[PDB]
Amino acid sequence: QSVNKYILSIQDIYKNSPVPVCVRNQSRKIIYANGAFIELFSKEDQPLSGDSYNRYGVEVFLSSLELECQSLGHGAAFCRRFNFHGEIYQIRMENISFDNNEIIVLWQINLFP
Amino acid sequence: QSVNKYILSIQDIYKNSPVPVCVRNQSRKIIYANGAFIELFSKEDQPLSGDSYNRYGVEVFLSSLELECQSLGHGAAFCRRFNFHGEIYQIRMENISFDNNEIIVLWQINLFP
Ligand SMILES: [Cl-]
Ligand SMILES: [Cl-]
Ligand code: NA
Ligand code: NA
């Protein structure tokens, strides 16, 4: 609702963007993601290449960060780093809460500078 | 133009937000900022309290980061930390470039977790 309007705005900004972005609901479900995000996490696991070449460790780390973000309350945000397929990334997460205490979290990812 | 539309979207997302955000043009001019950002940097210098209690060192650091962001090209982004009035902050910067090679940079700031 007001969540849908928020999503439409994120989409307007990020739909054609090189910056991988997504928005997830309280059930860890993606409710918005752009092409860049889809492509980033579409890399097939290469389990033998190294410990960062599968999604599972990073998934738990990122889900854990997201839970922390949800817990910090409306407007809470932070930036952290993680490794994925041999590259270092940063991720910013932000808590957006709505009048019905519905919580969504914005993810924005970049390659580490 | 297309910059104005981008700005309208950022405004829709961040106008009522606790998250300090701004957008600056190539001449280091603010073309959008929300209330949270205005309030953050409205703190009067307290030059005697410590080296982080004035805007000048952080201004040069942040302007330097911004120039790097501009140089990295469309879609470039990174997260860094800085100190201001005795607190640690993170800042994410993102390069948004338009078809006429007009460059704007989004700033998003948070208190360090
Ligand atoms: Cl980190
Ligand atoms: Cl830093
Ligand atoms: Na909370
Ligand atoms: Na460049």
* Phi/psi at A25 (5° precision): -85, -175
Identify the helix (H) or strand (E) that includes residue A94.
strand A87-97
Q: Which residues in chain B touch residue A112, judged by CB atoms under 8 angstroms apart?
A: 78
- Closest by Cβ to A9, choosing from B13, B77, B94: B13
Give the burial string for A48-85 (b: 16+ CB within 10 Å, else e): eeeebbbeeebeeebeebbeebbebeeebbbbbebbbb
Is CATH 3.30.450.20 what the domain over B1-113 is classified as, yes or no? yes
* Residue carrying structure tokens 């950022």: B10
CA distance B91 to B84: 12
Of A23, A28, A19, A30, the C-alpha closest to A6 is A23
Contact B92 A78 (CB under 8 A): no
* Nearest CA distance, A10 vs chain B (angstrom): 8
Contact of A20 with B77, CB cutoff 8 Å: no
CA distance B90 to B96: 20
Specify the resolution in Å: 1.7
CA distance A16 to B96: 11
Tell me how long chain A is: 113
Contact B112 A77 (CB under 8 A): no
Which-ligand-closest: CA of B103?
Answer: 4
B70 touches chain A (CB under 8 A): no
Contact A12 B9 (CB under 8 A): yes
Which-ligand-closest: CA of B113?
Answer: 1
DSSP code at position B73: -
- Closest by Cβ to B77, choosing from A5, A13, A110: A110
Method by which this entry was solved: X-ray
Q: Which residues, numbered 45 to 64 in chain A, qualify as contacts with chain B under a Cβ-Cβ cut-off of 8 Å?
A: none
Contact A78 B9 (CB under 8 A): no
Sequence-distant contacts of A56-59: CB under 8 A, at least 24 apart: A58/A82, A58/A83, A58/A84
* Residue spans per domain, chain A: 1-113
Which of A2, A3, A19, A97 is the best mutation test for B, with the most CBs of B within 10 A?
A19
CA distance B36 to B58: 18
